[PDB]
Structures are given as C-alpha cells and as structure tokens.
Design a protein around this nucleic acid. Structure first.
Ligand SMILES: [Zn+2]
Lengths: 323, 43, 905, 117
DNA sequence: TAGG
C-alpha cells in the first residue's frame, strides 16, 4: 500500500471525502496506521455522508442513528451538546438537532472500526431541510462526477534544438518558417532587414554554431536562407540599386496581368508554324521586356498560378497553348 | 448745349449710393429710411 | 445703365428726363460692375385673344433660349419664346388685355398644342397651400442663399426660381406682391416660423422700392451665390434640406473661412475637376438623406401641366442631422458634463465604502474618467478640425479659429497613425469619443460626508478625442528640382520624449548646451543616398549600418508618426552635399558611439509605402536584463505617481498574471489613451523585484507606449470559473480567481474593532486613544476580520474574509450585524481565538451549524500573482488520529481571500 | 441493521423484476387509501400506460393522506397469496414539487457508474 | 519603495 510518509501530500487526506456507504463499508484499513482507510490508494481519514434516518437509539450523552442512502446502512455516533439574540439562536441550533425516523441528516466524521463492524463518529451533524427532495437529488448527480475526476484518478526536436544541427543544415531549416510569415501577412515586398527584426525568426538564427561579430554573421544566415526561396522560385528582385529588396511572386498581380495579355495576340504571331506557343515563346518577350537575368524557376511558376482564369488548355507538360 | 450729368459720369463718380428728388425738399420716411440726398439731374 | 422702371408701358424708344432718380453702385461681390437705377415714378417726356391676367409665372427662363409663360382667363395659357421678353414687366395681374395675332403650335414633353406667339403686339410627409400674399421685407437672413424675412413672421426663400435681377432691389423696405406661393408650416430643421417660397409658376412682382441704403459689405455674408444655386438646380435638394444646408455652411464659416481658407474659395461652386471644399464637407450627410438619382426638374411641367413642383408641393419635416460645433464649445461643454456627473457617493457605494479610512476613501476619488459620445446627442454633433503637430511640445492636435483639442489617432484597430502627410489636412469624423479625465484633490473625513459640500480642494480636467482614421474623411486644404537628397531607413526603437542633457562639443572652449526637450530613434539604413529625379528618386550611391537620429528643437514635431517596423524616408533639401546622411548635438546617454546624426530643422520625413514581446519567463528572480516588453489590458488606474494594474495578453500562458506599472515625475503626464479597458502595448520597461518578491514595472526614458485599441462602450461580466479546490494544488496552469462551492469546517479567529478614520488607532467610545495627539473630527469606522477553514470534497483551504464580508459569512442580517457592531463600540477590541453577553454569543455562534454550513465561495489567491515562489521540499507534521502520533510530509496550506459569499440553495 | 433501500422504478416493480423480500425505494402518486385496513396504492406512468404499486401503511400508522401528490416509499417487498405483492413501508414521505424527470434521470447515472466498476 |  501507500507509505505513511506520503499520505499528507494527497489533498484528500485533509478533506471530508464524499463517498458512498457501499464504499465506506468496503474500504481496506491500513495496517500501518489504524483509523485510516485506503480507497484506490488515497488515504481516507474522514468522510461526509447524507442519508435517511432509519433508527434512533439514545444513550446518556450520545445518539446512535442508522443512516441509509440507498447504497448501504451505517451507524453514526453523534455526541450530545444581546441576550435576546443569543436565546433565539439556541432555539435554532436545537431544531437542527431534533432528529426522528425518516429525516434527512448530514454527518461529517471519521470511521472507527469495532471488530468487523464500522461506525462513523460525527464531529458535526444537523437535520437537512429537504421538502422537495432537491438536495438528495443533486447529490446523486454530483457523486459520479467527483469520483470519475478525482477519487478514481491515481495520485502522483531539431526545431526545438536548432543548436545541434549546424549551418549547412540550418538554412533549409529556417526558410520554411520564414515562408509562413509571408503567407497570411499579405506582404507584397519586403527588405532583408525587416525579417532580421522579427523575434520569431531571429531566435532561430543566432545559435551556438556561429561562435566562429555574431550580429554581422546573422546577416549571412538570412541572406543564404532568403536565396533558397529564390532558387526554388518564389521570391524575386529587379534591378533597382540595392540588393536587399525582394518581391513575392504569389502576391503581386501586375506581373500576372502581363502574363495574361500575351494570349491577346496568340503570343503575337500567326499559326502557320508549330501549333501554339512554347514555354520559351514567352521567354522571347519577357526577359527582353522586364529583366534579362530572369530565372527560369519563376517563368512557368506563374503559369502554375493563374490556371483557374480559364486561360489556355494545359494539355501536357513543356508546352504552352494558343486559343 | 453743355448737357447735364450723363450715364458715364454716374458710373465713374458718386459711388456712395446716392438718390435724388427734384420735386421739393422732403424727408420721405413713411415707415423707415435712413438717407442719401443729392441734387443731380439725369435725363 | 440698368433701368428698372416700375409699372412699365410701351414708351420704349422715347421718354427721357426722369426726375425721380436713385442710383446704387456695385456691391463689392460683383466683379462685372454694372450698378443700377431705381426710377420711382413716371417720367415726363390665327385669331386674337382677350381676358384677364391670372398667373404670369414670373419666370423668364434660361434653358437655351429665354421664354416665359402667361395664362389668361376670367383658362387659356400662352407661351412666348421670341425677343419680346420686355412684356414681362408691363403685365399686371387683374388688368384686361387685347393681345393679338396668336398661333397654335406643339411642344415637347406632352403634345397638347399650346398657344405660341409670333411677330405680335399687345393692347389694353406633409403638403403645402397656395397663398397670395403682399407684404414688406423687414430684414435679410442670407442674401446669397435667398432667405429674406418679411414682417415679424413668415420668412421667405427665393431660391427655387432663377433670381439674379432680384438680388439688386431687395433691401429692407421693399413691398412685394406674391401670387402663387407654396406655404410650408412645419418645415423644422432649426427653423420655427412658417416659410414662404415661390416656384416657376408664382409671380414675384414689386409694388414700391426701398428707401434705405444697403447696409455693409461684410465679406462674411456676401459670397457663395453660385454654390447655393448648385444645391437646387443640379444637386436637386428639397426645401427642408436646403435650409439645413445653408445653416451648416455658415456654421462652417465661423470655423474656417477667414483664416484656414478664404470666403471666396470655400463657397465657390464645383468645377469639373475637384473644387468646392464647402460641398465636399457636406456630402457625407447629403448622400444618405437625398441620394443621387432623381426625376429631373422639367421646365414646362411645373407651369402647364397638373402641379407637380420641385419638392415644395410635397415636403418632409426633417430634424437636424449634423450641427457642426466649434472646438471651443466641445471643450467647455465637455468639462461641464464632467463635474455635473461627478458624484462622490456613486463612485464609492454604500456597503463597501463604509469601512475605509480617510486616506483610502480619498485615494479612490482622485482619478476618474467618463466617455461622452457626441454622435448620440439631440443635434448629433460632428467633429472637424485641422490636424496640427506642435513644434514646441510634440503633441498632435485638431485646430480651428476658436481653440484646439488634443487628439489620439489610430489608423485601424491595432495599427498606429504613421503618415506624416496628414499635417495641415482637414479631418472630418462623425464616429468619435470625447474623453474627460477628472483629477480631484479631496479630504472627506468618512463615508457620511460624501454628499456634503466643502471637502474638495482642487479639481481639474483633461479633455481630448479618440477616433479611427477609417471612420473619418481627410481632405487637403487648397492653397490660394534636382536639389534634393534622400535615404531610407527601417525604424527599430523610439525613445521617450523628455528633457535631456547633452555632451559638450569637442575641441571648442568649454561650454555646455542647454538641456532641451528631445528624443531619438534607432534605425538602420537600407541603401545609399538617392537624388531627386523629376518626381521620383534615382539609384542609390554605393554603400554596421545602425544609426541614432537625434530630434530636438523644431524637429521634435515628428514624434507621433514614428513607429517600429515601418520604413520611412528622410528628405533633405538644398544642394547635393556628398557626405550628408553619414554623420555630422549628442545626448549624454549616447557617448562613445560615432553613429549619431542630428536631424536638421528643414528636413522632412515621409512614409515610404507585430511588435516585440518578452516571454512569460519575465517572472524570474535571477535576471540581468531589466528590460521587458509586453502587450496588456488596463484594469485600474490610481493616483498614488500613477499606478496602473494591467492584465497580460499572452497566447502561451493560459490565465496570465496581473502586474503593476508605476509612472513617476519625469514621465508623469502620461499618454492619452491609458484608460481602464484599453489594450496598450508597452515596450522597454524597468523590471524590478520588490522586497516581498513581487515583480513590477516602471517607466524609464525608453518606454514607447502605443495604444492598440480604445475601451469598449459596454462592459461585460465574463464571470469566474467553477474549479475544484484540489486543482489549485495538483498540476500547473491553474486560475487565481474562481468559485469552488465548499463547506465551512471551523473558525480560527474573529476581530471586531473600531478605528479612528484619520489614523488606524483604536477608539474606545469614539475617542482616539492613539497617544493624546490632535485630530479634527470625532469620527470612527468599524473593521472586521475572520479566518475560516472551508473545504471541498477534494481539498481544504484557509479563507480570510475582510470587513462587510464577515457578515454573510456568519449569516447575519444587516439589521442585526449593525446592532452587533455598536455593542463593541464601548469595548473597542473584541477578539476571539478559537464578557458575559458578548464572548458567549460569539462563541455559541461560531461553533453552531448555523455558521458551519455549505456555502458558495468566490475567492482569489492571496499570493499576489506577480510573486516569485521558490521550489522547496515538503515539511513534516504530526496528525495524531485516535491514539497514534505518526508523521507525514505536508505541502503548505492554501490561503485564499474572499470576494463574495453566497448560499447554496 | 436493515438492508439498504436501493432505488427502483415503479414499472420495474410492477412487472416482477425485483425479488420478494428485498428492500426498495420506489415512488408514485397517491390515489387510494384504506383507513380501516391500512393500504395505500401509488400510481405512475412509464411511457404510455399506468403502473401501480401496493403499500401497507401500517408502521407509520397515523397517516394524513395527501391524495394527488407524489410520495417516496421505503420498505421491504413482501408477497401475499397469489401475486399480491405489497410494500411493507417503513418510511413514507410526501414530496410535492419534486422534479420527477430529474429524479429518474439521476437513478440512471447512479446505475451507469456502478456498471463501470 | 511599491502588499501585508
Ligand atoms: Zn486618530
């Protein structure tokens, strides 16, 4: 069983446990300390019952009421006990202890075994005024709940650790959580130093791998992580003077209304030739127009995007379509 | 000849809201007025 | 020269020598000149129709070709298009005529072949009435609008017909003769008298001229006659809306028209592009009351057909929508409803504030506030001002030519105003709050004096406004090359605005610059210096890029537009200096770093187009950072120094704690929206740990308060949860305010003393038994402390109930709690530690089942959730049961503090 | 000490689902009462029909009847000659205003928890 | 200084 030194850590040790009298009459008593009973490994020192009086036996100074609560019957041993306010108070605490057969009584005390028949020695008892049977109905609904939640329960990583995996494995472990910032924040364009001030992406960069100026070396971990979004083909930049400005391909659609207006003339050529256009028939009108060093990762990734504008027939790979 | 005040002489002078009555000396106020008396002769 | 004969005849090529002269010059609003005459009396030198004149309709019109319509009979109607418009003055209603050689011809609109002339000669929802008046004009009300006043009642409005020859001869003293005029009785909208108003069918004729001279060119009530004509013939308003519009438009003239702009520029009509600020400033109201899309006002249908007039026949009584106040009226009618609503016995209710000494009764009356919503009044006022930024203090304000109000502006919800192009712009907001903060220095002795005058020493208010820019309308006020550089920077942190010391300049003779009001930001350059090319900027010059930008002097006015995370642009005029935005007065706390740059007085910032948060381990003890940043929500505010109690807003903590923030003397007039209810973001604060191991924050010179939202209109309850008592012990993530229906076991102690309510010293029979010192008033208050041992079915606890919670913990009626509490007034220190009438009533009460009863608690942990608790092993206790004294390990007991106590059922 | 008065339903005890001799705590509504020979019949309705129980009100003998009200009985189910099963009442308390759909709900959760042990 |  549970050792005696570990009993006081249980919070039910110092509480009046709301138990059935079927459980009070069936709990095992501890061989260590007599007077303490164990239900499911919890030390039960004192209880709290509510039931109907079915017997009254008076002695000199105590009563011994029998109490039934539809689960069991047990004997409870209840010990006998400005001047206009004290007098009428004493005729109130004598009507709470005027108990006959058929009344409802609340008894809070401690279990004392008496050679294979148990009793409850009440430190506090009174007569419960239950005219419409409300209190004894609310106890039948509460007692399965306090059992199942309290008395039946027993008493008792590379993302999380980025400092282990090093820098060539950490650039590809920062860009995917940098990409999710760009999704719901409707960001059209950004600078490189704007991501170096978000604490959601700064604490995942200055790991103890980079002890070999640290705050100058965190520019290198952000530059090599943003670039992986560019060789994959999701961000891009135009010739504007500074090298830290980037644009997201997914958000801006002035470029999407230049890739859609090439079909207005069937890529500006008649169709005596090869049927339709190709992926590189855009390329003769896109790099000479916009940027000569435009990467091919974003050339057809825009055509992956506007496919639900009823644009052309995506009949197969490596092939554009005319009307 | 040497005719009297003309329509151009009243538009280039007497710009203080004048009035005139060549009948007789009268201070006409049947209900109320203030004034502006003068003695020009337009024709 | 503009002859204006009365009762004309066809002596047209003759009849000079007019001996009844009257001349009037131009009247300073007429750029065309052309003064007029007033000839008083007569000068000294297929078939034919007849009948009597009835209407004559008064309206030579101006569609493309001028024409007027006359009707005839003792009815026949004749229209006259050609150049014999001079007949319009030689026709009187009543006289019989012999007008000859008419013709029959059709007309557009409805073909009914009305009589139309030739080269001919002449011989001899509510409704409105059609009167036929004659009276005298006794006063003018709005000469450009057309609102004249007749006799002691019955105002006039000549706006619904083409009047330009009638504005000359309309002075007080003319005698009109109105013929077919609608009379409006209950037009409302601020007007009280009935209003008389003709239309295209009613004759407006003259019987005698005026004798008085014109009053005065005021340059306040003489302009705008083409704008008022636009509000009838293009933007087809009705007469209840016309008289509201002409009253609001001169109510705006008292706020802007001499000094913000001019009278001739405000009241100008709208051209094709976008002029007429005065009409754009009424258009939020005129669009939801008279929306565009309406049947056009046809010419011939108002005269020939069944009478369906432009809405003078059928009108709608209107109550006043807007009524634009001035910024001085909003400030003085704001702190007049603040002290009329100041009731000190409603801020401190009766059962709770009957147990407070004088030092704590007056501390809770010190600071208070109220929020008036002026778009809920009877005329439903609308805020309007010019947004200025003070170059002497740094604060934002709205301004007109009567006064100024401080303002707090958010762009959106949880988004600050960061656009410097709004300085000098008209802001028009109809959804706004008017906050008045009361600051009262009072010395009430006790709770009985809270309705007696003579105890308030000082009271002052603080009035400002809060609104969003998405709920407003911003209009720019119209005014009557390659020498420019630029550089972008990303702002990281902005410091506080306060007086600072400055280091002495190096190499010069020893002199200290003056301590000035200043602030500085920390940014990072995003590129080289760009030069202005046309209207844009060129390519940057080829470039650690951190920089401190020092704002002092006249450059301090950019304070409310600089926020972290935004990208700004620093513009400098003048010649292209090569090294300008690299380096150069320096503050005392910025010594050593060579990366400062003083912002000059003629430079200009513009906006080229989630904040920091410390984790919930700012509740640690061994810290070496002392700078915390969090978003919170203000619960209370107290004038101790100003103390704020904030509830943290942390998505990871699940019941986050409550902190205390203290603002002190250099920072002491705080930011504007620091009201109970507002969500406010606090960046870098001074985190301290007190002597009782509580964590509190203080304002440093680096704080940057930013208000995220305004307090809501209606406060909701959101009641406490219903925990089990064991859940506060086992496991983590537990509340510190819950309910926990329980049952009382015993009573530990009970004290029922009386104190002095100047000091906290015991009063036997109310006599101040401290030492024999002086006290001004023989008053005394009661106190009460009890300690209990409630327990659930699951665990046990200790609850301390304070005064007025000791009643209803003992179950006493307030009639018998009061009669118990003046029996203790003679011995003022009844204390029980579980002499004939007491101490035997209380011992019988606190051991009876009338007190040890099932109860419904509502508590809070007394451990003050800011507190650092250290992990320690459990102690050892005895717990004898029956006859055997064993030993167990025990945790420390729960200690709670009661908020309320109810019964079960 | 007696046996515990376990909660039964009036349609469970009229159909003979409870043995003779055991203690029970059923309920009902008072319709008849025989003052001369000490008999009370309570009545209840399961879902569509009427069920009735027989109570021998002899131990709580001075009995003021409250015809048309609910009653809680507690006693031993004995059995007379040829199918007449009466409840020898020890406690017969008069509750009126009792939430009867909430009472026979609470018997179902108490039986359901005991089945899961 | 910052709960008592
Ligand atoms: Zn004193």
């Amino acid at each position: 069983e549970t050792p005696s030194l570990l009993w006081g850590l249980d919070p039910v040790f110092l509480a009046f446990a709301k138990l059935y009298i079927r459980d009070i009459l069936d709990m095992k008593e501890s061989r260590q300390v007599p007077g303490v009973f164990l239900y499911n490994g919890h030390p039960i020192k004192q209880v709290d019952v509510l039931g109907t009086v079915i017997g009254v036996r008076e002695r000199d100074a105590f009563y011994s009421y029998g109490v039934d609560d539809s689960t069991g019957v047990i004997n409870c041993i209840c010990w006998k006990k400005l001047t206009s306010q004290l007098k009428k108070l004493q005729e109130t605490i004598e009507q709470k202890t005027k108990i006959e057969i058929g009344d409802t009584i609340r008894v809070r005390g401690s279990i004392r075994t008496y050679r294979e028949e148990r009793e409850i020695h009440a430190t506090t008892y009174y007569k419960v005024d239950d005219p419409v049977w409300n209190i004894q109905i609310a106890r039948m609904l509460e007692l399965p709940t306090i059992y199942r939640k309290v008395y039946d329960q027993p008493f008792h990583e590379a993302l999380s650790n980025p400092g282990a995996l090093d820098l060539p494995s950490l650039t590809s472990l920062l860009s995917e959580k940098a990409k999710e910032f760009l999704m719901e924040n409707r960001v059209q364009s950004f600078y490189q130093q704007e991501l170096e001030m978000v604490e959601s992406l700064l604490s995942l960069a200055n790991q103890p791998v980079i002890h070999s100026t640290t705050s100058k070396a965190i520019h290198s971990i952000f530059k090599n992580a943003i670039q992986l979004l560019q060789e994959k083909g999701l961000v891009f930049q135009k010739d504007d003077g500074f090298d830290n400005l980037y644009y997201v391909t997914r958000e801006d659609k002035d470029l999407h209304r230049k890739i859609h207006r090439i079909i207005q003339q069937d890529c500006q050529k008649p169709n005596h030739m090869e049927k339709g256009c190709h992926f590189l028939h855009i390329l003769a009108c896109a790099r000479l127009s916009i940027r000569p060093g435009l990467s091919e990762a974003v050339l057809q990734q825009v055509l992956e995007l506007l496919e639900d504008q009823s644009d052309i027939v995506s009949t197969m790979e490596h092939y554009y379509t005319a009307f | 000849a040497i005719s009297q005040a003309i329509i151009r002489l009243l538009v280039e002078d007497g710009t203080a809201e004048a009035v005139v009555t060549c009948r007789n000396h009268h201070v006409a106020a049947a209900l109320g007025l203030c004034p502006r008396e003068w003695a020009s002769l337009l024709d | 020269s503009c002859e204006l004969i009365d009762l004309d005849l066809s002596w047209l090529g003759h009849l000079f020598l007019f001996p009844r002269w009257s001349y009037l010059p131009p009247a300073r609003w007429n750029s065309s000149g052309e003064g007029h005459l007033e000839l008083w009396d007569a000068p000294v030198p297929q078939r034919n129709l007849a009948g009597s004149l009835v209407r004559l309709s008064a309206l030579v019109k101006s569609k493309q070709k001028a024409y007027f319509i006359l009707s005839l009979g003792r009815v026949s109607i004749i229209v006259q298009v050609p150049a014999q418009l001079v007949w319009h003055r030689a026709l009187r209603p009543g006289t019989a005529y012999v007008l000859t050689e008419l013709r029959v011809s059709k007309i557009r609109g409805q073909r009914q072949h009305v009589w139309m002339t030739s080269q001919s000669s002449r011989l001899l929802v509510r409704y409105s009435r059609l009167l036929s008046y004659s009276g005298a004009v006794t006063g003018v009300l709005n000469e450009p609008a057309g609102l004249y006043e007749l006799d002691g009642q019955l105002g006039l409005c000549l706006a619904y017909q083409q009047f330009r020859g009638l504005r000359r001869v309309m002075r007080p003293g003319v005698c009109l003769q109105l013929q077919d005029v609608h009379l409006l009785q209950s037009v409302g909208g601020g007007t009280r008298r009935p209003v008389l108003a003709p239309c295209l069918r009613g004759a407006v004729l003259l019987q005698s001229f005026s004798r008085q001279k014109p009053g005065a060119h005021s340059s306040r009530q003489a302009y705008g006659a083409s704008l008022y004509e636009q509000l009838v013939w293009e933007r087809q308003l009705g007469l209840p809306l016309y008289l509201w519009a002409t009253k609001a438009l001169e109510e705006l003239a008292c706020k802007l028209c001499p000094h913000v702009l001019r009278h001739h520029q405000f009241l100008q009509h709208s051209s094709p592009g976008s002029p007429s600020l005065g009409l754009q400033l009424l258009a939020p109201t005129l669009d939801l009351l008279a929306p565009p899309g309406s049947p056009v006002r046809n010419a011939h249908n108002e005269i020939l057909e069944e009478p369906h007039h432009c809405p003078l026949q059928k009108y709608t009584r209107l109550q006043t929508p807007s009524s634009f106040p001035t910024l001085a009226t909003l400030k003085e009618e704001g702190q007049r409803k603040a002290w009329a609503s100041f009731d000190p016995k409603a801020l401190l209710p009766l059962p709770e504030a009957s147990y407070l000494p004088s030092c704590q009764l007056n501390r809770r009356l010190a600071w208070s506030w109220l929020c008036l919503l002026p778009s809920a009044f009877c005329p439903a006022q609308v805020l309007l001002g010019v947004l200025v930024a003070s170059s002497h203090k740094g604060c934002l304000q709205l301004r007109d030519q009567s006064g100024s109000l401080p303002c707090l502006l958010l762009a959106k919800h949880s988004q600050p105003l960061s656009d410097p192009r709004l300085i000098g712009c008209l802001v028009r907001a109809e959804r706004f709050q008017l906050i008045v903060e009361r600051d009262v220095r009072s010395s009430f002795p006790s709770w009985k004096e809270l309705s007696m005058p003579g105890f308030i020493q000082k009271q002052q208010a603080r009035v400002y406004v809060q609104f969003f820019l998405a709920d407003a309308l911003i209009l720019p006020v119209p005014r009557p090359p390659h020498l420019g550089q630029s550089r972008l920077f990303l702002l990281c942190h902005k410091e506080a605005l306060m007086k600072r010391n400055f280091c002495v300049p190096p190499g010069a003779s020893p002199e200290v610059p003056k301590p000035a009001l200043s602030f500085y930001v920390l940014g990072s350059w995003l590129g080289g210096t760009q030069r202005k090319e046309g209207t844009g900027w060129g390519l940057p010059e080829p470039q650690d890029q951190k920089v401190h930008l020092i704002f002092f002097g006249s450059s301090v006015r950019w304070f409310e537009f600089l926020h972290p995370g935004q990208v700004y642009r620093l513009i400098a005029p003048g010649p292209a200096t090569p090294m300008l935005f690299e380096k150069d007065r320096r503050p005392l706390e910025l010594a050593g770093c060579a990366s400062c740059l003083t912002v000059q007085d003629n430079w200009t910032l513009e906006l080229e187009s989630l904040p920091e948060s410390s984790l919930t381990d700012l509740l640690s003890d061994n810290f070496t950072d002392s700078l915390v940043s969090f978003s919170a929500e203000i619960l209370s505010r107290t004038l101790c120094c100003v103390k704020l109690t904030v509830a943290l807003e942390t998505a990871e903590c699940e019941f986050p704690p409550h902190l205390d923030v203290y603002i002190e003397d250099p920072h002491l007039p705080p930011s504007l929206g620091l009201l109970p209810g507002a969500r406010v973001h606090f960046s870098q604060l001074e985190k301290r740990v007190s002597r009782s191991h509580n964590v509190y924050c203080c304002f440093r010179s680096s704080t940057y308060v930013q208000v995220l939202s305004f307090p809501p209109e209606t406060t909701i309850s959101i009641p406490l949860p219903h925990i089990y008592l064991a859940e506060l012990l086992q496991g983590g993530q537990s509340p510190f305010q819950a309910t926990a229906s329980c049952h009382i076991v015993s009573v530990f102690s009970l004290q029922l003393f009386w104190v002095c309510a100047y000091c906290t010293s015991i009063c036997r029979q109310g006599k101040c038994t401290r030492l024999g010192s002086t006290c001004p008033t023989q008053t005394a208050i009661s106190q009460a402390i009890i300690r209990l041992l409630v327990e659930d079915g699951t665990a046990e606890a200790v609850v301390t109930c304070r005064n007025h919670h000791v009643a209803a913990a003992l179950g006493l009626c307030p009639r018998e709690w009061a009669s118990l509490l003046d029996f203790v007034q003679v011995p003022g220190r009844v204390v029980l530690q579980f002499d004939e009438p007491m101490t035997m009533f209380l011992w019988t009460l606190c051991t009876s089942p009338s007190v040890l009863r099932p109860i419904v608690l509502s508590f809070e942990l007394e451990r003050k959730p800011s507190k650092i608790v250290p992990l320690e092993p459990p102690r050892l206790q005895r717990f004898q049961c029956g006859e055997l004294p064993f030993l167990t390990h025990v945790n420390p007991r729960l200690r709670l503090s009661c908020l309320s106590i109810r019964e079960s059922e | 000490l007696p046996k515990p008065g376990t909660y039964y339903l009036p349609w469970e005890v009229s159909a003979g689902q409870v043995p003779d001799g055991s203690t029970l705590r059923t309920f009902g509504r008072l319709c008849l009462y025989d003052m001369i020979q000490s008999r009370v019949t309570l009545m209840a309705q399961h879902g569509s029909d009427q069920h009735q129980v027989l109570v021998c009100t002899k131990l709580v003998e001075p009995f003021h009847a409250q015809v048309g009200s609910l009653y809680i009985v507690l006693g031993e189910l004995q059995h007379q000659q040829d199918r007449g099963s009466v409840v020898k009442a020890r406690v017969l308390t008069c509750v009126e205003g009792m939430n009867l759909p909430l009472l026979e709900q609470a018997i179902r959760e108490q039986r359901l928890y005991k089945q899961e042990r």
